[PDB]
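Escalation from tier 1.

The customer reports that the assembly of four entities below gives different structure tokens on two consecutive runs. Tier 1 could not reproduce it. I'm attaching the input and our single run for tier 2 to review.
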Amino acid sequence: QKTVVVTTILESPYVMMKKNHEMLEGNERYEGYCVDLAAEIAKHCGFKYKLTIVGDGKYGARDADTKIWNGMVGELVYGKADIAIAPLTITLVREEVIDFSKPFMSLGISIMIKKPQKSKPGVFSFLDPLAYEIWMCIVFAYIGVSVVLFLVSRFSPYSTNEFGIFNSLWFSLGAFMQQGCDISPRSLSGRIVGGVWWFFTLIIISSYTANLAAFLTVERMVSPIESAEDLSKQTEIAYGTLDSGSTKEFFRRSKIAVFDKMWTYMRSAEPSVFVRTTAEGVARVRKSKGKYAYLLESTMNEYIEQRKPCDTMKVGGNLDSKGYGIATPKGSSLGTPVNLAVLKLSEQGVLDKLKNKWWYDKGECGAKDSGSKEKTSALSLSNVAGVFYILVGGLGLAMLVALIEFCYKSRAEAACGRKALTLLSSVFAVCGLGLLGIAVSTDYWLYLEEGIILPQNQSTEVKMSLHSGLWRVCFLAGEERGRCFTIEYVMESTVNVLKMIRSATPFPLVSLFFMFIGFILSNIGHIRPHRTILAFVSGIFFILSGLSLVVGLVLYISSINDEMLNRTKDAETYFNYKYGWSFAFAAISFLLTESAGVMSVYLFMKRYTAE
Amino acid sequence: QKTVVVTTILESPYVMMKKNHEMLEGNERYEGYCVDLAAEIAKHCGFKYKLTIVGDGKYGARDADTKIWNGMVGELVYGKADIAIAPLTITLVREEVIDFSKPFMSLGISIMIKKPQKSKPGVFSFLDPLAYEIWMCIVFAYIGVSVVLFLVSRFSPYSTNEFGIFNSLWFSLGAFMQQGCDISPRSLSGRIVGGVWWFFTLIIISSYTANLAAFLTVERMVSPIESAEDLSKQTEIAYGTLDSGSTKEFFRRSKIAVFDKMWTYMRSAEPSVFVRTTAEGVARVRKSKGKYAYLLESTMNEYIEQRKPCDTMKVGGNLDSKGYGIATPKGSSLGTPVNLAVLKLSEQGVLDKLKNKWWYDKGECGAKDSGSKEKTSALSLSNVAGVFYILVGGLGLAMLVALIEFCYKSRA
Amino acid sequence: QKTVVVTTILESPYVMMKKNHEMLEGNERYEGYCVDLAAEIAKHCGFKYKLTIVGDGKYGARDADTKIWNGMVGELVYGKADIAIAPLTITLVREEVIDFSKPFMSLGISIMIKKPQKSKPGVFSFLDPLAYEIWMCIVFAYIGVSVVLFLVSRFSPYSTNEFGIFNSLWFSLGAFMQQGCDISPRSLSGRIVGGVWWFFTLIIISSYTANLAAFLTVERMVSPIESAEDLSKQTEIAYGTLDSGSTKEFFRRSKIAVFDKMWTYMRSAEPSVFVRTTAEGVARVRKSKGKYAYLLESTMNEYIEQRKPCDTMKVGGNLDSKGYGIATPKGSSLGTPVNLAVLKLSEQGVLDKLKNKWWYDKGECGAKDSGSKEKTSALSLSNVAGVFYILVGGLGLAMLVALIEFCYKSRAEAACGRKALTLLSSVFAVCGLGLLGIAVSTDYWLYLEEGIILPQNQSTEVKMSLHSGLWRVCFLAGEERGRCFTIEYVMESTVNVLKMIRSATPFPLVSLFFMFIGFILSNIGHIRPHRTILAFVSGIFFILSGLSLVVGLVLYISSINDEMLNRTKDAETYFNYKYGWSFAFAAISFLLTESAGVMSVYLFMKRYTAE
Amino acid sequence: QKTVVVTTILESPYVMMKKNHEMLEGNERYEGYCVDLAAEIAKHCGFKYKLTIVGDGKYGARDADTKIWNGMVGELVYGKADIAIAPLTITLVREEVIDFSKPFMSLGISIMIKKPQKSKPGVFSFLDPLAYEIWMCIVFAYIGVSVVLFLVSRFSPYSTNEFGIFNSLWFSLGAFMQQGCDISPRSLSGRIVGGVWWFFTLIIISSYTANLAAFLTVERMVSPIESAEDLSKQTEIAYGTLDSGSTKEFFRRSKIAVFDKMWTYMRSAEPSVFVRTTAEGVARVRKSKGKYAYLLESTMNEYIEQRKPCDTMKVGGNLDSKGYGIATPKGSSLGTPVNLAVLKLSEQGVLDKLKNKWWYDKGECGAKDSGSKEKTSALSLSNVAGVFYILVGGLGLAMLVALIEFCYKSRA
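Tier 1 run:
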């Protein structure tokens, strides 16, 4: 008896080329699932076979014009082959011309998404419930309360008062942390400043606990996709199929209410969700950061999942039911013994043994299914790592302060302070005047950039950029030219920002007017050491200078933030902002002005004692 | 056989030109709602048709001088067209010269406003979790406990009177603010007052923190107006219509008491609320931060809501009632089968199937497009900005007290 | 010319009988909307009319057998009338036989729900985040810490210690409220009891703030129904239509995807959602506590809303579009002048004027639409009323204690304590032994009732009830008989509860064994006042008696609560529980045993001082 | 014309008897899935039919002694029936005597477990918002701060040494527990240690309270097992099949390494995991509190899930593959038009439309029936029960310390 000619198509992992395919001849060139299946059927039916490949590379369809078949269905009908052992779907139009066996594999439409990965949080992500502009203003308000509580306590008739500057910074730190205090204010003016600082720290701590609970609750409500119902109702993730095939024709003629709504989305969608081939459809899933899902066959979805780089995952269940079968020509002697051989292999578990060998045992994603089990939700050390770093760094600093003050006291035991306090008061005052005087004149305060993204390419293109000041605006990228207008010379939202910068104008000018008064009285007190009231009055103008600058910065930053708030959001437009080095000089000028006001009071008390 | 000439006008989404209209020719150039309606009626009635745009570009009116109709009504009277499938409003003046069918779409006058978004927080928005009648009862109870703690401690001593009237206010302030106090009561009648006032503050502070967590988690936004009578009873938000059309003529000759008050406002208003075109009226709504409301037809108001940048919405219901009809010349043979076709499509749900396809399915933003996007944000400085202002104001007032204490120490 | 016969049907508010309808003749018997509309049309067309009522009471339809019409459509086709001014819907099968005008009213399908009312919260609803069994055990733990901290401090060599019983109850109260303390423990055994009570109060206070935020967040996510989309996706509220009419036939033949899902629910629903008439459909809405919604015409929905008792509300927009029209016979001279009269009345606002007069100006729900505007969410005085009542009641008690102790000190100024302390120690001990001895012997500890509801009638029918003890169970309603078995004589979930009562058995027997030891040593100390160690040792057995009973009650109540937790919940089954008067005798026995242990230590110290 | 005799078997929801079956007669008595399938095939093929229940009540088998088929297969071989529309499993032994069509339903072996519900809380479930590696780093940092506060305070005095090694542990314990302390540091190097340790506890306690509010608001429940390989790697949960059928014979002659380990467990297991009937196997799942899992076919497992009291669910996927077919006698003239009818119904989505109607639309509890019901509950005593046990255990240990201190005071 003569050999049976077997036709097959090249698909992985069904039939693949072996590596030594130039050096081998005959049936040993090939390997795969269908090669091992052809050896099993030929053992039961009892024939010899020569294994070939279809020349066209198609599965089989009828031309509407010429009414002829192509592919593997063509080689069966027109006589070129005797059996077709290949992933050939049992359909109606193929059943009328050839004979299929019972199915040896069941499959359907499935869903491919990108695998969820774990992103490590930042080390200082515990600071996230409040903006960084609040954490800066708490430190400014802490210095402001501690200086005023000193001045309002150590007056000229003071009795036996205790609130020096070292006790005042320790009282305010204990009140903010709600840890109690060793001593309390007893004067009526001391209780006013102590009472308002209690109401400040009550609102801030309750705002941190409340907004942190809002982060952890919204993150817990986020649930992934696990069915085809969830894709239909949820429209931040795009999904599409291949451009021409049986998968697209399924959603077209369907009448199921779930699948009608999915074809309504894929019909009217800009840009195209349909891809041209399978490799293009997988490549969109891997790079779109979890925003794209792909619909394909159930067996290719399980094969790509077991390959490197191991970054895709199959979710849900199948949407329909199909089958693959062995095909013979109509009216052949191989019709019945092939059909009994498939049912015999299916009951001895041999068909389930070959699927485990090619899909999983040659899997490069080694035992990936074990990693899908673990899931929990609690705080870990990655969330609160930066709190321990501040604790270690605080203990290391206390070792250094205990060491250098140990050697400083031993050296002392085994009008110098008046002269050193005189010279330190003057250097901080000149640096206090000069740093604010530069900052008001210059105009590098706020940077603003507005741009538009380019989709599907990961690139942004700006349209406008500038830097602004209190009176002068110079475009850095406006008309690609360094043109400079005043704020009165107008020309959208960026116009409304520039008007609010003009609103908070007077408060730095109040502070600059007050330091210049205190600078004159401080030098003429150094000229004439008699009439010692000049040092105490000059200290008050330094403290009123800094508190006038605090309400200037709070009202400035508040006027900036709400102008980004009222604008309409878009998915294609980004808007950023950034401070400048003039804003840093105003904040540094606060630190030098308050510190020079404290030294003037110690200059008063040490000089009034000698008088 | 004879080709019926169908006249129409070009307005979205009724009749639109396709993007490759230079390639195609004839009926394949056009698309829209009224094109799909022309295909359904010609199938039931049984004729063939050729779509033509009207040359004048107007719906229809009568000149008082020359008495000549212009527009789609002018083509039906003088014979240039056979049927007008278009949004033509069924009125009395047009009814005397041509014939309409039953209405295939019902509409009215509605209100367009800007969508409510996240707003600028007020300076005293930190005291929003508790109502105003709670904050005043805390102050009244603060004075009441400190008076009772003084009176009880006076005539019942147990040496020195550590609890005066000035020290009792300092004990009760430190107890509310979760801080400690240096002195404590030492009598049975004194420790009952301190014990109850401690249990008071543990409930109030825990109720404040628990209600901020409900606000920051779930975001509910409300619209200011929801009816036409609310616009008559306010003056914060301005409102107006287009300068020439049937919308302005409705508010002029209205005898309804609500609609007559609205016309006295719109007539004597400076600056002018009236606009030139439709797009200028939409543009004032988007730029005025929610201080302007535009009054237009309900079918356009639902169409602008479904287009980019998706910024507007419709509030309330319709103000009047009117309809759109299909017009034939007086005495045509098409008048009766067109009339029976519209009532047949309406009961089969086909007219609801076409409006659902062009208004909602072609919408750039769906109902669940805006619904799926949520995010949570860090607190900005503008939220807790009012707490800083009380702090600096308390620092300034504390220095004024120390001045007038020294003056009372200098005179003494 | 002859009078025109006008046919009409009796519907409110279209045509109604006037009150003097027996005493009037002609057209003045009737009133309504259609009576005022008939006077307007007859003014423009210029005729005289006599107004009649159709005899059948139907609107009009064709019999499938005999092919004849009935109702008002019948009187037009067969010649009995000349015009029909009535709410007659423009449909296709009516258009072929008679002539309608243009519509004078537009309407559709709408939704009727019960109006949301405001329910006042309880005065003590601030206690709701914790169960009442926790608030009881905090008070027991407060007494237990304050006694042990006294005993562990006032030992026999004590120096200069301060922790008496009046300072110990004040230290523990300040630690629970986190308000600080005047003095602290200094002995190592005093710091252990002070440290664990700090960890108890940290977990309890953090549990109250966290669960209160869970109440207010879930209540804020609850959103009502405002569209037909929300009825389809949300299935705790049933909705139905009338049993036979055009409203039901709309949902049957519809092909809209939203309306297909609504007919799928109303088809397969047990029991019946369909009602027989309109008055039955409104009556189900008013009594089903907001669990039922009704679908009806748009104009009857707006008319019922303006009538007493004013408890229904219209939500959403219309689902379809219909019209009402004037009908004349086909081929009549009244065809064209009626059609021009309707368009003339519609443009002069006269049709909108008559609708305001009958629907709203005769409205009994006077200006109800103004009350729908107000909406806010914050805590009010109704939520926290009980906190102010405790504050007022605490200040009123302090007035009474300050008054009676004022008269008590003035009377004293202008072995008695040993004898009174001797007799008070013995009476509390006998009452301590006798109250627990009754409670262990009896078996009225826990009541359990299980039943099943009866739907749509607001009535419950029990199936089983009993009371239980530590060894004996007697059924109160089991087999409607007072039968009594032991727990070993078993016969579901109630069996599992009864085994857990056996689990917490030993701990009351440990406490009863310890008081009987302390009772013997206390009396023989009263017999022999020498050898004064008998009073101090007997005080320790009283304190160890109560602490053994605390862990008995905690383990008992924990074993009860989780047995209601593991059972499967049903909408038709209710399960309740309740304590008995044996449980009250064990809790009272704790108060007498601890108090007798404190008096024994003062009996020791006052007697050892005289020795 | 000739009436075709259709044989079938009575199993829900395939073939069921209607409730008023005594009134009706003939084909009107029955309803179900396979009755609707018989109406569709007789319409395409073009015949009339008369439904009969098989008298034996069995699907089909062959006696080894008498070699006589019994059941629905026995009626097709010996001529009493013409076609068998029923869930008849396509096997090899039945294929040699009759002919099947292509499969109209695909199924396999699945796993039934009890639904995850709210569980009994453990005694130490109060420390669930923070992980175990955080609680040990708090203890390690507690010792580290108290040692540094001692060493710094010793050789740098500023009189008396208020901060010993025993007083430093008491300062740091009161600082973590939000209480106050009576003594405070008085040096620059000492106040830095107290300042940083205060900012540590403000973040940790606020992170504990914020994460309990996330747990109590949103309830997520997890199932223990989700695959067949998880049952092989555990011994907490028992599992078994029915005593006689194709489900037990699958695990016997299986050479797969996962399925062979499962048979060594099920054979040598005491007490017996095997049951008598299907309803007894479902009953052990509902009563054993989630310690038993039953292995059955996937089509019944989806049907029990949609019935009252709605207590079970299906986990994982199928273990094998098999199908159901329509059987005709070998050599009938109906064999080819029945085969082409099943492939025609399957592509038109009609077989998915019938399974969706009987499994899900007739379900007593839907997917959104269990989804719409939410409620929030007060904390019970069993949640915070472990905190009471530490308190009483601390009270007992404090009395043992005072005994051994007096003995060291008596010897001294």
